Design a protein around this nucleic acid. Structure first.
Ligand SMILES: CC(C)C[C@H](N)C(=O)NS(=O)(=O)OC[C@H]1O[C@@H](n2cnc3c(N)ncnc32)[C@H](O)[C@@H]1O
Ligand SMILES: CCC[C@H](N)C(=O)N[C@@H]1[C@H](O)[C@@H](CO)O[C@H]1n1cnc2c(N)ncnc21
Ligand SMILES: [Mg+2]
Ligand SMILES: [Zn+2]
Length: 862
RNA sequence: GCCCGGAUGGUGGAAUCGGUAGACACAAGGGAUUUAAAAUCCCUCGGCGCGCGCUGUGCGGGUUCAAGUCCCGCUCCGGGUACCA
C-alpha cells in the first residue's frame, strides 16, 4: 500500500487484470433485482493477430460497458469467436497444418491480447462457433426451417476454375484469371440450398421505421438493398418458339413505346437461337467470362447481339426484335425486360449504339412532344402515340394498361423485390455441415434428430484442391429409413453462425436446446450493438431476419434484436502488393515498403526492402487479407493498454472513418503522467477535511463550476453522443485548471479531493487500470468498477453572466461580458461603449439590429 | 456503373439546434532548468500586408443580417455490391 512517483504501467496493469479474473468482476447472472444492459460488440474472425480496427471496436464497447456498470446496472459484455471461414483453409495448406488447430492457435493468441488490453468481458460465456456444441443447434434449426417450407433447392451461378474443378470465392478471383493458376474462371450453374428471406421482405423493410435509435445511413442502405417495388409482369408470344417470355416493369405506362426486348445471357430463348446463329453462340460463350459480381456487370460496356426471334407486342400487334445483352440481371425480375429506349437512359445508349428504333410515347411537362436527339426523357407525364391510351396521366396509364393486360390474360400486378434469397451452400471444408440426406431411393430429406449433429472431423489432411469430407467417400455414408444414404458434403455460409451468436451468449452452456428462453428474454433485445459500417447490409439484415425466425419458433419475444446501432468508422491503412512469379498476389506491409511521395501528400512510387515494384491500392480497411494491420502489442508493451485505449478514443469520434497514424500516442502517455503526478502530490500531504459549500472565494467557486460542468458534458458525450474525443478533451481542460489552482489551504484541498475523485471516475471507462489504482490512493468506497457515476450539482453550475459577441455587418469587432438576465437595450448600450464598434458606426445609420439572447448581436449598417 | 458516407492549419480533430472558425492534442521552431542528455516547464504557431486590416473550412455558383453548417452542379477519397469476414 504505497504509491511511486513515476507512473509504471507494466507493474500496475497485469496486477489489476489478475484481480478482475480472480474476483470474477465482469461475470454476471440473470439478476432480477438489477436492471439489465446488454452491450454487444461484433465477434472477430480469429485471423491470428489483432489490429487497430479491432481495438477501436472493443474499446468503444468496453467504455460503454464500464460507463453503464457505474450507472448501477447489470452489464453483460460478451466475447466469442467467428471461427469458421475461408482463410483458415489456405493458411493451413500453406503452413502444413489442418484448419482446426490453426484456428485454435489464433483464438489462443488473440485471447491473450484482449486480456492484456483489459476489456471487462464475461469470459465464462465464451463461444467458439467451430465447435459442435455451437453448430449442432443451427443444424437442428435448419431442419425445422425446411419443414416450415422456408428452405428450397435451386440452380445458382458460381465461380469455377475449370482445370482444378473447384469452387472459388469472389476474393480469390483477380483481373479475370484465378489467383493460383493462369487459367480463366467460368460461370457454372450448380444446385444449392437457399433460405426464403424474401418471405420476410416487407417485415424487414417496414420495421426500419420502428428502429429510431439506428442511424439513417444504415437504414436507408437496407431499404435500397431490399428495394420493394410495385409493377407488372407482362407476358409475350414468339413466332418460331413455343415457350413464352415474361418481363417485369415498374413503368407499364410506357409499354406502347416498347420498340425491342433485351434478354439476359443465361436465358432459355438464347440457347434455341444460338444453334443456327454462329455469332450469337460466340456471345453466349463470351458471357461465361462474366464474373459473379454486380460491380463488373454494370461497369463493362453494354454489348449485345440480335437473337433473330421476333416477340409479338400484344397491344400494337407488332413484331419486335429480341436481343441478347450483358447488363440484364438473371435473378432480379424474370430475366428479360421491355426496353423503352426513349424514356430510359440505359436503354437509350443501347438503342443509339446498335441503331434500334426510338419511339416516344410520354409527353413533356408542358404538354409538348419530347426531343429525343440527345438523351431520354425519364420523367413521367401524359401519354400520346399510344392508340387508345392517349391523353391519360401516369396514375391512369399505370392502371389502364395493367387492367387491359389482366383482362387479356397475359399480364399481372406483382410486388417485386431487389432482395434475392439467401444461398447458404458452400463447397469447402471448414464450415458447419448442412444436415440433408440423399437416400438410395433418389429422394432428398432432412437429417433426422438422433443423427444431429453432423460433426465435421477436425483430424484431417488437405491437398488444397478438394475438401477431405468430399474426397473420402466413406464419410458421406449413413443409414436412414433402413437403407443406404449419402449426407450433404456442402457446408454452411459463415454468416449462419454470426446470425444468432448474440442470442446464444445468454445461455452458452445450455445442453437441452438452442436457447434457454428464461435467460434469453431477460437480456434480449440488445441495448447497444457496436460493429463496422462494413456490416451495414449483409450481416445486419441476416442478423434481424434470423431474430424474426427465432421469434416465430417461440424462442424470443422481441420483434427486433438490437435497440441502438453504433457503426464505428473503418480504421484505414495503405495497402501494397507485387505479382508473384506464377501470378500470385503477395501483399507487402506498409512497414516493409519504402515510399516516394508527392508534394500534396499522395504516393507516387513504392519499393520494398527486397526490391520489387509494388502496386499501391490506396487507403483501405485494416485486415490480414491485404496485410496492412498494425499489431497493438508493441505499443501496449511500450506505453501500456490505457495509453493505447485513450489514444484510439481521442483521435476521432466513434462514427468517423479514421486513417491510422502513430503520431499522437505520446500525448496520451503525457496526459496520464500529469494525472498521476497531481494525485501523488495531493495524497502525500495527507487526509482532507469536509468540504464547506458556502465558504469559497470567486476563484474557488469558478473552479468548482468547471468541475461540475465537465461532469454534465462528459455524461452527455459518452451517454447520448458517443463523442469520446470531446469528452476526453473536456477532462483535459479541467486537469489543466486544477494544476494551476493552488492547494495550500484546507478548502482548496477539500475541493481538490472532489475534483480528483470526479476526474478519476470519468477516466475509468477509457483508462480502467490507472483509475483502479488512483481510486484506492484517493481512498474511495470499494472498487472503482462498481462505484457510482458522478452526478453534477445544479446549484454549483449556476452562471452570473454570459459572453456576447458584437458584429457590424456580420464581422466581429468586440466581445463583452453581460449579466444573464439582461435586455437587448442594455447589450446595445454596452456594445456602443467599445471603440472598435463605434469606429464603424460613425458616418452611417443603424438600419437593422439582430440580437440572439446571451449569444450574439449583429448591427446591419448602411 | 449503382447505393451509403467523408474532405477544416505541417497533422488528428473542435464548433452539439444557421450564429466568435481552429477548442483539446500531436509535430516543428526558439527559450529555460540540467555536468551534456533524458525528463519536466514556458513562448510562438492558417495565410497575405501588427496594442491593426483583409482573407480563410475540397472545387464552381446561389439564398440570408449571418453559411464549415442550408440549396443546385462538380472533383477526389473510403465502405458495400450477395462466396472476404
Ligand atoms: C458478426 C460478424 C459478421 C463479424 C465478423 N466476425 C467480423 O467482422 N470479424 S472481424 O474480425 O473482421 O472484426 C470484428 C469487429 O471488428 C470490426 N473491424 C474489422 N476491421 C476493422 C477496421 N479496419 N476498422 C474498424 N473496425 C474493424 C468489425 O466491424 C467487427 O465489429
Ligand atoms: C421506361 C423504361 C422501362 C424499362 N425498360 C424497364 O422495364 N425497366 C425495369 C423496371 O422499370 C426497373 C425496376 O427496378 O428495372 C428494370 N428491370 C426489370 N427487370 C430487370 C432485369 N432483370 N435486368 C435489368 N433491368 C430490369
Ligand atoms: Mg487537408
Ligand atoms: Zn485456377
Amino acid at each position: 500500500s504505497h504509491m511511486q512517483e513515476q507512473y509504471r504501467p507494466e507493474e500496475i496493469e497485469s496486477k489489476v487484470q489478475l484481480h478482475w479474473d480472480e474476483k470474477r468482476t465482469f461475470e454476471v447472472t440473470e439478476d432480477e433485482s438489477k436492471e439489465k444492459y446488454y452491450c454487444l460488440s461484433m465477434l472477430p474472425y480469429p485471423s491470428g493477430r489483432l489490429h487497430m480496427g479491432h481495438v477501436r471496436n472493443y474499446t468503444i464497447g468496453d467504455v460503454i460497458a464500464r460507463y453503464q456498470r457505474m450507472l448501477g446496472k447489470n452489464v453483460l459484455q460478451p466475447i466469442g469467436w467467428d471461427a469458421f471461414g475461408l482463410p483458415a483453409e489456405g493458411a493451413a495448406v500453406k503452413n502444413n497444418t489442418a484448419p482446426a488447430p490453426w484456428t485454435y492457435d489464433n483464438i489462443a493468441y488473440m485471447k491473450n491480447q484482449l486480456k492484456m488490453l483489459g476489456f471487462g468481458y464475461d469470459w465464462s460465456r465464451e463461444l467458439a462457433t467451430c465447435t459442435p456444441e455451437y453448430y449442432r443447434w443451427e443444424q437442428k434449426f435448419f431442419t425445422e426451417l425446411y419443414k416450415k417450407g422456408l428452405v428450397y433447392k435451386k440452380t445458382s451461378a458460381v465461380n469455377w476454375c475449370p482445370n482444378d474443378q473447384t469452387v472459388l470465392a469472389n476474393e480469390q478471383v483477380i483481373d479475370g484469371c484465378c489467383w493460383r493458376c493462369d487459367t480463366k474462371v467460368e460461370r457454372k450453374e450448380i444446385p444449392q440450398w437457399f433460405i426464403k428471406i424474401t418471405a420476410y421482405a416487407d417485415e424487414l423493410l417496414n420495421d426500419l421505421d420502428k428502429l429510431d435509435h439506428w442511424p439513417d445511413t444504415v437504414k436507408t442502405m437496407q431499404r435500397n438493398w431490399i428495394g420493394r417495388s410495385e409493377g407488372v409482369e407482362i407476358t409475350f408470344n414468339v413466332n418460331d418458339y413455343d415457350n413464352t417470355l415474361t418481363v417485369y416493369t415498374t413503368r407499364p405506362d410506357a409499354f406502347m413505346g416498347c420498340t425491342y426486348l433485351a434478354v439476359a445471357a443465361g436465358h432459355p430463348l438464347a440457347q434455341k437461337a444460338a444453334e443456327n446463329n454462329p455469332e450469337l453462340a460466340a456471345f453466349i460463350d463470351e458471357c461465361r467470362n462474366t464474373k459473379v459480381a454486380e460491380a463488373e456487370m454494370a461497369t463493362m460496356e453494354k454489348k449485345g447481339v440480335d437473337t433473330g426471334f421476333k416477340a409479338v407486342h400484344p397491344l400494337t400487334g407488332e413484331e419486335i426484335p429480341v436481343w441478347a445483352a450483358n447488363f440484364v440481371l438473371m435473378e432480379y425480375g424474370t430475366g428479360a425486360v421491355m426496353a423503352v429506349p426513349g424514356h430510359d437512359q440505359r436503354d437509350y445508349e443501347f438503342a443509339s449504339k446498335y441503331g434500334l428504333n426510338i419511339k416516344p410515347v410520354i409527353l413533356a411537362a408542358d404538354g409538348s412532344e419530347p426531343d429525343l436527339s440527345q438523351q431520354a426523357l425519364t420523367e413521367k407525364g401524359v401519354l400520346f402515340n399510344s392508340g387508345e391510351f392517349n391523353g391519360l396521366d401516369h396514375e391512369a396509364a399505370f392502371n389502364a394498361i395493367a387492367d387491359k393486360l389482366t383482362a387479356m390474360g397475359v399480364g399481372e400486378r406483382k410486388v417485386n423485390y431487389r432482395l434475392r434469397d439467401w444461398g447458404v451452400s458452400r463447397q469447402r471444408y471448414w464450415g458447419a455441415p448442412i444436415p440433408m440426406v440423399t437416400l438410395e431411393d433418389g429422394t432428398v430429406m432432412p437429417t433426422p434428430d438422433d443423427q444431429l449433429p453432423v460433426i465435421l472431423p477436425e483430424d484431417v489432411v488437405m491437398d488444397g484442391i478438394t475438401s477431405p469430407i468430399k474426397a473420402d467417400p466413406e464419410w458421406a455414408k449413413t443409414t436412414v429409413n433402413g437403407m443406404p444414404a449419402l449426407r450433404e458434403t456442402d457446408t454452411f455460409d459463415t454468416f449462419m453462425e454470426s446470425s444468432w451468436y448474440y442470442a446464444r451468449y445468454t445461455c452458452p452452456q445450455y445442453k437441452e436446446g438452442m436457447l434457454d428462453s428464461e435467460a434469453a428474454n431477460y437480456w434480449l433485445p440488445v441495448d447497444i450493438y457496436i460493429g463496422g459500417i462494413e456490416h451495414a447490409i449483409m450481416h445486419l439484415l441476416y442478423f434481424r431476419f434470423f431474430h424474426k425466425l427465432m421469434r416465430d419458433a417461440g424462442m424470443v419475444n422481441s420483434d427486433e434484436p438490437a435497440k441502438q446501432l453504433l457503426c464505428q468508422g473503418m480504421v484505414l491503412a495503405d495497402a501494397f502488393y507485387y505479382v508473384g512469379e506464377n501470378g500470385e498476389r503477395n501483399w507487402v506491409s506498409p512497414v516493409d515498403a519504402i515510399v516516394e511521395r508527392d508534394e500534396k501528400g499522395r504516393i507516387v512510387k513504392a519499393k520494398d526492402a527486397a526490391g520489387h515494384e509494388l502496386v499501391y491500392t490506396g487507403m483501405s480497411k485494416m485486415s490480414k487479407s491485404k496485410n496492412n494491420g498494425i499489431d497493438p502489442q508493441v505499443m501496449v508493451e511500450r506505453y501500456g493498454a490505457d495509453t493505447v485505449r485513450l489514444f484510439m478514443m481521442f483521435a476521432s469520434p466513434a462514427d468517423m472513418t479514421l486513417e491510422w497514424q502513430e503520431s499522437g500516442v505520446e500525448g496520451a502517455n503525457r496526459f496520464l503522467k500529469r494525472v498521476w503526478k497531481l494525485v501523488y502530490e495531493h495524497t502525500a500531504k495527507g487526509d482532507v477535511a469536509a468540504l464547506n459549500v458556502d465558504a469559497l472565494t470567486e476563484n474557488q467557486k469558478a473552479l468548482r463550476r468547471d468541475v461540475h460542468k465537465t461532469i454534465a458534458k462528459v455524461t452527455d458525450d459518452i451517454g447520448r453522443r458517443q463523442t469520446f474525443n470531446t469528452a476526453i478533451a473536456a477532462i483535459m481542460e479541467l486537469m489543466n485548471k486544477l494544476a494551476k489552482a493552488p492547494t495550500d489551504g484546507e478548502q482548496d484541498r477539500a475541493l481538490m479531493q472532489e475534483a480528483l475523485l470526479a476526474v478519476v471516475r470519468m477516466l475509468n471507462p477509457f483508462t480502467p487500470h490507472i483509475c483502479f489504482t488512483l481510486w484506492q490512493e484517493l481512498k474511495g468506497e470499494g472498487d472503482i468498477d462498481n462505484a457510482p457515476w458522478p452526478v453534477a450539482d445544479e446549484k454549483a453550475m449556476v452562471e452570473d453572466s454570459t459572453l456576447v459577441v458584437v458584429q457590424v455587418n456580420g464581422k466581429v469587432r468586440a466581445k463583452i461580458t453581460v449579466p444573464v438576465d439582461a435586455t437587448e437595450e442594455q447589450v446595445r448600450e454596452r456594445a456602443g461603449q467599445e471603440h472598435l464598434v463605434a469606429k464603424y458606426l460613425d458616418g452611417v445609420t443603424v438600419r437593422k439590429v439582430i440580437y440572439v439572447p446571451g449569444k450574439l448581436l449583429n448591427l446591419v449598417v448602411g
